[PDB]
Write a protein that binds this ligand. Sequence first.
Ligand SMILES: *[C@@H]1O[C@H](CO)[C@@H](O[C@@H]2O[C@H](CO)[C@@H](O[C@@H]3O[C@H](CO)[C@@H](O)[C@H](O[C@H]4O[C@H](CO)[C@@H](O)[C@H](O)[C@@H]4O[C@H]4O[C@H](CO)[C@@H](O)[C@H](O)[C@@H]4O[C@H]4O[C@H](CO)[C@@H](O)[C@H](O)[C@@H]4O)[C@@H]3O)[C@H](O)[C@H]2NC(C)=O)[C@H](O)[C@H]1NC(C)=O
Ligand SMILES: *[C@@H]1O[C@H](CO)[C@@H](O[C@@H]2O[C@H](CO)[C@@H](O[C@@H]3O[C@H](CO)[C@@H](O)[C@H](O[C@H]4O[C@H](CO)[C@@H](O)[C@H](O)[C@@H]4O[C@H]4O[C@H](CO)[C@@H](O)[C@H](O)[C@@H]4O[C@H]4O[C@H](CO)[C@@H](O)[C@H](O)[C@@H]4O)[C@@H]3O)[C@H](O)[C@H]2NC(C)=O)[C@H](O)[C@H]1NC(C)=O
Ligand SMILES: *[C@@H]1O[C@H](CO)[C@@H](O[C@@H]2O[C@H](CO)[C@@H](O[C@@H]3O[C@H](CO)[C@@H](O)[C@H](O[C@H]4O[C@H](CO)[C@@H](O)[C@H](O)[C@@H]4O[C@H]4O[C@H](CO)[C@@H](O)[C@H](O)[C@@H]4O)[C@@H]3O)[C@H](O)[C@H]2NC(C)=O)[C@H](O)[C@H]1NC(C)=O
Ligand SMILES: *[C@@H]1O[C@H](CO)[C@@H](O[C@@H]2O[C@H](CO)[C@@H](O[C@@H]3O[C@H](CO)[C@@H](O)[C@H](O[C@H]4O[C@H](CO)[C@@H](O)[C@H](O)[C@@H]4O[C@H]4O[C@H](CO)[C@@H](O)[C@H](O)[C@@H]4O)[C@@H]3O)[C@H](O)[C@H]2NC(C)=O)[C@H](O)[C@H]1NC(C)=O
Ligand SMILES: *[C@@H]1O[C@H](CO)[C@@H](O[C@@H]2O[C@H](CO)[C@@H](O)[C@H](O)[C@H]2NC(C)=O)[C@H](O)[C@H]1NC(C)=O
Ligand SMILES: *[C@@H]1O[C@H](CO)[C@@H](O[C@@H]2O[C@H](CO)[C@@H](O)[C@H](O)[C@H]2NC(C)=O)[C@H](O)[C@H]1NC(C)=O
Ligand SMILES: *[C@@H]1O[C@H](CO)[C@@H](O[C@@H]2O[C@H](CO)[C@@H](O)[C@H](O)[C@H]2NC(C)=O)[C@H](O)[C@H]1NC(C)=O
Ligand SMILES: *[C@@H]1O[C@H](CO)[C@@H](O[C@@H]2O[C@H](CO)[C@@H](O)[C@H](O)[C@H]2NC(C)=O)[C@H](O)[C@H]1NC(C)=O
Ligand SMILES: CCC(CC)O[C@@H]1C=C(C(=O)O)C[C@H](N)[C@H]1NC(C)=O
Ligand SMILES: CCC(CC)O[C@@H]1C=C(C(=O)O)C[C@H](N)[C@H]1NC(C)=O
Ligand SMILES: CCC(CC)O[C@@H]1C=C(C(=O)O)C[C@H](N)[C@H]1NC(C)=O
Ligand SMILES: CCC(CC)O[C@@H]1C=C(C(=O)O)C[C@H](N)[C@H]1NC(C)=O
Ligand SMILES: [Ca+2]
Ligand SMILES: [Ca+2]
Ligand SMILES: [Ca+2]
Ligand SMILES: [Ca+2]
Lengths: 388, 388, 388, 388
Amino acid sequence: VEYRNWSKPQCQITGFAPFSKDNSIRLSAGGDIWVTREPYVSCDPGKCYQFALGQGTTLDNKHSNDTVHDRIPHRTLLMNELGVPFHLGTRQVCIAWSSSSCHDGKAWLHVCITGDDKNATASFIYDGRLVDSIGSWSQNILRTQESECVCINGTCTVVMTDGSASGRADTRILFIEEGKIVHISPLSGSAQHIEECSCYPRYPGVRCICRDNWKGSNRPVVDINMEDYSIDSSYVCSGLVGDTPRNDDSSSNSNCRNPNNERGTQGVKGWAFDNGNDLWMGRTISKESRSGYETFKVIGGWSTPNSKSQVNRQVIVDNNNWSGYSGIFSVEGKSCINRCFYVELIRGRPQETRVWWTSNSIVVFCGTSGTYGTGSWPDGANINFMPI
Amino acid sequence: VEYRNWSKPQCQITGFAPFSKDNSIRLSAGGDIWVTREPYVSCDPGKCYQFALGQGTTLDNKHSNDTVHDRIPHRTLLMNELGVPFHLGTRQVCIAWSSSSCHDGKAWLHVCITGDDKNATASFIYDGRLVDSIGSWSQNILRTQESECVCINGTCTVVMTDGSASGRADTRILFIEEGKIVHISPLSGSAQHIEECSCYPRYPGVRCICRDNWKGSNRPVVDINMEDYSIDSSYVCSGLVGDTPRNDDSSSNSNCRNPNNERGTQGVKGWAFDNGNDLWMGRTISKESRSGYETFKVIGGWSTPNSKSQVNRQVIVDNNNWSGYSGIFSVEGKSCINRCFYVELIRGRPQETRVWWTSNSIVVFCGTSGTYGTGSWPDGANINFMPI
Amino acid sequence: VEYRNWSKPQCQITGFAPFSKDNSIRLSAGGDIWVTREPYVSCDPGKCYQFALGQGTTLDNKHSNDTVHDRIPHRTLLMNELGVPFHLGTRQVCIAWSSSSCHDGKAWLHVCITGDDKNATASFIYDGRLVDSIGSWSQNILRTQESECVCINGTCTVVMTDGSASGRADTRILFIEEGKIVHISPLSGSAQHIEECSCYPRYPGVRCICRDNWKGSNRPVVDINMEDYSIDSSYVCSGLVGDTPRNDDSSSNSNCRNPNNERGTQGVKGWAFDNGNDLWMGRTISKESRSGYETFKVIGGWSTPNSKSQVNRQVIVDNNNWSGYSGIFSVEGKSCINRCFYVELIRGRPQETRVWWTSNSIVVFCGTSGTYGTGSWPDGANINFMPI
Amino acid sequence: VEYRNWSKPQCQITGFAPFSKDNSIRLSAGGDIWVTREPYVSCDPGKCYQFALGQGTTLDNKHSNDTVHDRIPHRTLLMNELGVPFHLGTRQVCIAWSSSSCHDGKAWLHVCITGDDKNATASFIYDGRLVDSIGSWSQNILRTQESECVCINGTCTVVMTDGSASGRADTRILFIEEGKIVHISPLSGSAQHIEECSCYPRYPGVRCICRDNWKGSNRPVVDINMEDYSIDSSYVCSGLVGDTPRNDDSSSNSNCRNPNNERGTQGVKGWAFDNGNDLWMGRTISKESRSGYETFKVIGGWSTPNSKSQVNRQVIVDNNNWSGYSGIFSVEGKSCINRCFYVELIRGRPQETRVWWTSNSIVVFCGTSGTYGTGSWPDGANINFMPI
Ligand SMILES: *[C@@H]1O[C@H](CO)[C@@H](O[C@@H]2O[C@H](CO)[C@@H](O[C@@H]3O[C@H](CO)[C@@H](O)[C@H](O[C@H]4O[C@H](CO)[C@@H](O)[C@H](O)[C@@H]4O[C@H]4O[C@H](CO)[C@@H](O)[C@H](O)[C@@H]4O[C@H]4O[C@H](CO)[C@@H](O)[C@H](O)[C@@H]4O)[C@@H]3O)[C@H](O)[C@H]2NC(C)=O)[C@H](O)[C@H]1NC(C)=O
Ligand SMILES: *[C@@H]1O[C@H](CO)[C@@H](O[C@@H]2O[C@H](CO)[C@@H](O[C@@H]3O[C@H](CO)[C@@H](O)[C@H](O[C@H]4O[C@H](CO)[C@@H](O)[C@H](O)[C@@H]4O[C@H]4O[C@H](CO)[C@@H](O)[C@H](O)[C@@H]4O[C@H]4O[C@H](CO)[C@@H](O)[C@H](O)[C@@H]4O)[C@@H]3O)[C@H](O)[C@H]2NC(C)=O)[C@H](O)[C@H]1NC(C)=O
Ligand SMILES: *[C@@H]1O[C@H](CO)[C@@H](O[C@@H]2O[C@H](CO)[C@@H](O[C@@H]3O[C@H](CO)[C@@H](O)[C@H](O[C@H]4O[C@H](CO)[C@@H](O)[C@H](O)[C@@H]4O[C@H]4O[C@H](CO)[C@@H](O)[C@H](O)[C@@H]4O)[C@@H]3O)[C@H](O)[C@H]2NC(C)=O)[C@H](O)[C@H]1NC(C)=O
Ligand SMILES: *[C@@H]1O[C@H](CO)[C@@H](O[C@@H]2O[C@H](CO)[C@@H](O[C@@H]3O[C@H](CO)[C@@H](O)[C@H](O[C@H]4O[C@H](CO)[C@@H](O)[C@H](O)[C@@H]4O[C@H]4O[C@H](CO)[C@@H](O)[C@H](O)[C@@H]4O)[C@@H]3O)[C@H](O)[C@H]2NC(C)=O)[C@H](O)[C@H]1NC(C)=O
Ligand SMILES: *[C@@H]1O[C@H](CO)[C@@H](O[C@@H]2O[C@H](CO)[C@@H](O)[C@H](O)[C@H]2NC(C)=O)[C@H](O)[C@H]1NC(C)=O
Ligand SMILES: *[C@@H]1O[C@H](CO)[C@@H](O[C@@H]2O[C@H](CO)[C@@H](O)[C@H](O)[C@H]2NC(C)=O)[C@H](O)[C@H]1NC(C)=O
Ligand SMILES: *[C@@H]1O[C@H](CO)[C@@H](O[C@@H]2O[C@H](CO)[C@@H](O)[C@H](O)[C@H]2NC(C)=O)[C@H](O)[C@H]1NC(C)=O
Ligand SMILES: *[C@@H]1O[C@H](CO)[C@@H](O[C@@H]2O[C@H](CO)[C@@H](O)[C@H](O)[C@H]2NC(C)=O)[C@H](O)[C@H]1NC(C)=O
Ligand SMILES: CCC(CC)O[C@@H]1C=C(C(=O)O)C[C@H](N)[C@H]1NC(C)=O
Ligand SMILES: CCC(CC)O[C@@H]1C=C(C(=O)O)C[C@H](N)[C@H]1NC(C)=O
Ligand SMILES: CCC(CC)O[C@@H]1C=C(C(=O)O)C[C@H](N)[C@H]1NC(C)=O
Ligand SMILES: CCC(CC)O[C@@H]1C=C(C(=O)O)C[C@H](N)[C@H]1NC(C)=O
Ligand SMILES: [Ca+2]
Ligand SMILES: [Ca+2]
Ligand SMILES: [Ca+2]
Ligand SMILES: [Ca+2]
């Protein structure tokens, strides 16, 4: 087996086609299924896997009310082949209330963070063994991407933050070789707050679109140079911004450089990617709630500040249904690298108070150069049919 | 691994021997089992797999009443080794309310259709990644085989239809190489309505026996030329016709060219294959309902219009028990290509109204050159024991 | 991969050591577990598998009362790694109410019999495909070993019977190459009734110890010549006889040649094997009921008519607990071929009438050249804790 | 595949990082999970496995009250990939109420003890077959490590004891090649009572830290010479002693040679390892009960009698939560051999009498040369939510 280089051009896409759906919550009403949140997808050279952070319990289980507590020690990273729901035979890969995973072409790396809020531990597990660990540097919830990391030529990179979720924090970019941290670079550039980066290979480097939880409803961009470990950062140019909450399209702004200070506090994990001057992106349909999901291309969305001309819109989840986190993953084809994404479909609390638990299912779409129609692929569980 | 060519003669069979049964509905009364319909079987060069369209729920689950709705976004293609029932560890391969799958000798292709009735999307997934997609061309339930596609020398073919289920529609034959659509041929010849083709390799080409849902109780034939992409079509010659509904044996007709206009509207997915001038075929025992299943050879059933002399009858499911869809699959042996078939055994609605759900189990038989006896292998569940 | 020849001497054993137990019935009280009977064990070159005939249902399931009926069409052969209980992810290998399985060094052969009592079908499945089939020759419950078949140099042999279970029947020995029947030899010699043979490789031939259901409580022996397909048969010499029912040890007899006519009618599947003049054998502890299980060596038990000197007795299941069928399997070691056995532990009807079902668990022991102690390894379920 | 030699230096660790947690008891309240105790971890050259002794039942099952009885014949060794909870698809590897397992680089060896207290049998299973067995030598609960054995150059060693648990016993060290016992050495040196050794490779030999159940709260050490089979034994030097019960830190003693006669009777399985003059060790936080778990390095803890200066303490389980057995396992890295440990988290009887059963979950930590924070990772189940 050879290391992945991702040294193929990006696939020229026309939109996205349906790829996978796990129906987790529907199944939870008639079977033993893990309570989860913060899912993601990552593929080895042959096939894709779904990941999520378990809550140390199944849904039809009195322990499912534990989701009211943050970052419990029982949270573990779950890993299954994509489309296999999180049943009781699911492997718990590590202890984690925040994680990132990626395959370097030879083996899996898992970054798993657990322990006390003020003194967390990140474990680095490669090829089935613990290779390294790092402690909290700002004593305030050491945390990572909640989506796939990216490896080029045997060096994997992952973005981590420690510090305030509502003010200046300490973001660092780690470079990892076979599980061993070989370099750490501080965040540099004009991004002022970085959470939950959605990263993708853009040979020879890595590009991340993240969540500003402090002053921006425009999404920050982090650019990682894999040759010399240098970091740059800015904000997505698009005037159609990607965060939730955000302003209406008619009053939203981005200048590519600074947080827009428009309903900037809080946010949701999301993604976008460049194609020349243009931008492909997803976001919730609701401006203030994690409801619905849509994708579109913004003409000049990458290069032109405040660009608002969209095309190729697709509804993924209609606005009568709950969404959640979303993130990118990349899949190597015969001649190009394709971009795909997943959407977390959150059910239960806080939005649905009949039940005491919070959990999710997922839906997954992949880039296509072909054609497609329309639809909506929500979680689909009837809240009234669920164990409370 | 090399591409399949299927370039061996067809096995000379005397009838069929029992191969597999999954007992899905019986198990559903005492375990967590997926609600399904439209099952089929396809084998890689080593082993066979069972497929079905899930309804995003298990049977003992309040969501099982969702089967009243057509083409829900929660339908996914399920895939297990043949004989492994659809338990909660089953992989959902893609999002699909219509599908076809096949292995080209190197990897699996799945064709998965989902989305809105008037604007559906077909996704083409090969070797675990999305390679292509196509949108609806007639804005009226883009749909496909519900059984295995066929690949010769790395080119897979699949039959798709879009348009009316009760009048002239737009049927197209797709040619797919490693998941990429390389050519699309319109239907040609005298078949006037094509649904749910059961296709098989007949080197150097592919032959399909389908369902005419409009004017014929005789089954259409589609012949696919894999060398130049040309298409021909007609009707099975046999005066013993394969569709349900149909006339009784004394008043049924086929002229090999046109739909017979005998109880022609509606139908059921089924299969047949040629052996020289003769025809092996299956059908429901009832002429009006999806009850029972029988196979036999029709002497001159391929070459002689209105041929009605049968031999080698076998009851697969007696007429006191429900059947459903049936389809062909092909299995390469040491020196010949064998033909096998599955029968869908539908339980629940509309025939059994004690329950709200509709689901199925399967029974599977394979061609034999040896000898065999008699029996009946129905679903076997007691409807009174079932969750409603 | 090379064909198995079993061309090593037999291991020189001192008794048997515990190998495996599946706890099926205990687990059935708190989990979804298949209803089974007629289990056996067979190993590929690397590891062992447990097999059993399912009843198309789990135990905690209203369909579990179906065991009152004989040879239902829903019975299927189940196959799992040894020690994996028959959970819902278990593969159903074929449709069977009687079976035999074996690995030839390259691939698995399964012999699966199903269908009508008076007109059954035996299917022969090799390397995951149906290769051959044979119909009933005496129109009276075509049936086979219910334990492993044996292959030498790519030819597998299996013993089958058709006809009366309480009078002269028609026993035949089949020789199978890659799933294809290449020769059938009629039973020859002095054995007068043959059921459920427990066979083992004894290079260059195969030896079987079987069940006489007609006139013998001494067990018949069938010797199979793999070179020229010739058959010989007789009875185990030991005056300590292996069948149940049987006479007390003080009044039991065998002359090595004829059925003893001592409580000869009926029986139970069992095993024995030769080592020079001596015999290793198992049997129920009770003379008239399938209760308890014991093994011992009979000095001169192979060569001396009516020999009754035993040594090296071991209790496997004490006589306060139910047993059932038992059979041999052989395992290739570094320098010798070891003999192992399994015991079926039947729970439920007819002995335990609180419940309506009949099912079993298994315990497995293997030959040892070492030392060992004592114990008892019964099913262990409390009948009062079971679903009825 | 080549034999493991473990001929790399020990990794220089700063403490331990979180590796795995299975949440078994929490899951048992909403799923079918095995009742277990005496768990351990062992890895093949690629990945880690969790083992435990089943009680022949799931937790939500009336048979769960069987844990009141000692050493039932239904106890079997369970084996899953690390992090896969013991669901119903778990393989029971052998019959065992005491066990040890290890991989020699080519295949797994399992040592499985079962049968009567006064006459037990140890079975030795290698590469999926029974190779050897030994009977009880002292007729008083033949028993072994309950953690991984160690193999160097194809010879595996395991420590076994037979005789009194509260007085002088007969401890022997076995040397096993491909499942065959090749040599047995009696215990030699100054250790006066040996139970449940936690052993690790210390090339060219093996070192074990055990449990003195008779006169010592200091842990015995067994040194095994793999070249000439010679045995040495002593006690851990550290004045901070590892057993439970024990004296408080101000009044505990060890002289490296003799049991300390300080609350010496009874004990708990535990571990330690040397690094030069220093000692890494774990123990319960409570001095009297199996509550809490802590690790630390003792300066001069290996070489200096009664050394009590500790550094690098970590809480693994806080003292408000139940612990249990703990043991070491070793994992080969690129250039060093790492040490890891597991902690058994016992729930139910005798400490929690709302339920009748006793079971456990696990938490697992691995040596790190990096940095880390703090936390506590207890079982996490709410005893009031459990089936009784
Ligand atoms: C043990 O197992 C073995 C293996 O399974 C059994 O052997 C098999 O037995 C089968 C039944 O006998 C046999 O198939 C038959 O072959 C004959 C030709 O030899 C064929 O005529 C049979 O088909 C007729 O009968 C079946 C019922 O058995 C009907 O379902 C079918 O529709 C056919 O009936 C029609 O044609 C008859 C003859 O013309 C008419 O008498 C009848 O009324 C009916 O007429 C209607 O349809 C006509 C059009 O076909 C139409 O003109 C007219 O107007 C009416 O509408 C059947 O295929 C297998 O060949 C044989 N297999 C082997 C390998 O030998 C064996 O029996 C079992 N043992 C025991 C003791 O039972
Ligand atoms: C974020 O996480 C990091 C990493 O986990 C934290 O850093 C770690 O912090 C640990 C706690 O400070 C530290 O371990 C300690 O090392 C010191 C030596 O530097 C050692 O003395 C400590 O052991 C004592 O204290 C612990 C409680 O913390 C007790 O459980 C233990 O028994 C020891 O107490 C005994 O000795 C003391 C000193 O002699 C006495 O004062 C005390 O009363 C007690 O005496 C009894 O025992 C004696 C025998 O030992 C006996 O003579 C006497 O009679 C009494 O019976 C502990 O090992 C780690 O080294 C450190 N790790 C690293 C990598 O730096 C960090 O704190 C976290 N951040 C925050 C903000 O909390
Ligand atoms: C069958 O399926 C296909 C494929 O999915 C469908 O074809 C796609 O259709 C969509 C919708 O028309 C189209 O995306 C639009 O492109 C337009 C540019 O040509 C954009 O202007 C438009 O964005 C506006 O409308 C959206 C709602 O549709 C709003 O959500 C969005 O905010 C935009 O609205 C603002 O801007 C407009 C214009 O300035 C203004 O009037 C509004 O007030 C507001 O300020 C979408 O991005 C795709 O391009 C089509 N895809 C392809 C491949 O052709 C097809 O429609 C379906 N068939 C049927 C019958 O429905
Ligand atoms: C610890 O475990 C070991 C290993 O399991 C035990 O050692 C074995 O012990 C058994 C029982 O003694 C022994 O097997 C016997 O060998 C005798 C020959 O030496 C046989 O005579 C004897 O058979 C008779 O007794 C059985 C009951 O034990 C009856 O079931 C059986 O029908 C026989 O009884 C008839 O024959 C006798 C003699 O003619 C007559 O008196 C009776 O009335 C009746 O007609 C067993 O086969 C094994 O050989 C031992 N194995 C080894 C390897 O040594 C050991 O006993 C256990 N320790 C303790 C303390 O119990
Ligand atoms: C699980 O936790 C929830 C709280 O998150 C519990 O609900 C509470 O129950 C108490 C006592 O019954 C009430 O006083 C509170 O008002 C409830 N809180 C909420 C937010 O609803 C629930 O009882 C727990 N489940 C079980 C089985 O005990
Ligand atoms: C599942 O759906 C069916 C309808 O498809 C529900 O059955 C209906 O229930 C209502 C209220 O009880 C009745 O008034 C209707 O007559 C029923 N319809 C039919 C067609 O029978 C059923 O209640 C749903 N299941 C659950 C658990 O709510
Ligand atoms: C399963 O089958 C058994 C029979 O094998 C049923 O038990 C019978 O029940 C009927 C009516 O209740 C009684 O008249 C008979 O006496 C019973 N027979 C025996 C042998 O007990 C049982 O009811 C069936 N199970 C279910 C759920 O219907
Ligand atoms: C499981 O075993 C326990 C005993 O170990 C049973 O508990 C006993 O029940 C009886 C009758 O109800 C009481 O008189 C005893 O006092 C109980 N003993 C203890 C130690 O509590 C229990 O009933 C068994 N479980 C089941 C389902 O029968
Ligand atoms: C601690 C800051 C962080 C991102 C802003 O909060 C996230 C908010 C969440 C959210 O917005 O849904 C849930 C995440 N599980 C949480 N992350 C952690 C590590 O607890
Ligand atoms: C839409 C026409 C088509 C074939 C006639 O209807 C089929 C009828 C069905 C049937 O006759 O059982 C069920 C199939 N699931 C359905 N196919 C789709 C795609 O909905
Ligand atoms: C039909 C004769 C045969 C052996 C004598 O009866 C067996 C008796 C049985 C028994 O003695 O337990 C159960 C077996 N399932 C049955 N075999 C078949 C094929 O039905
Ligand atoms: C028999 C002595 C032995 C070690 C002291 O007792 C152990 C005590 C136990 C304990 O202290 O928790 C439980 C172990 N399962 C048991 N071992 C056996 C084989 O029964
Ligand atoms: Ca924000
Ligand atoms: Ca029709
Ligand atoms: Ca008999
Ligand atoms: Ca002690």
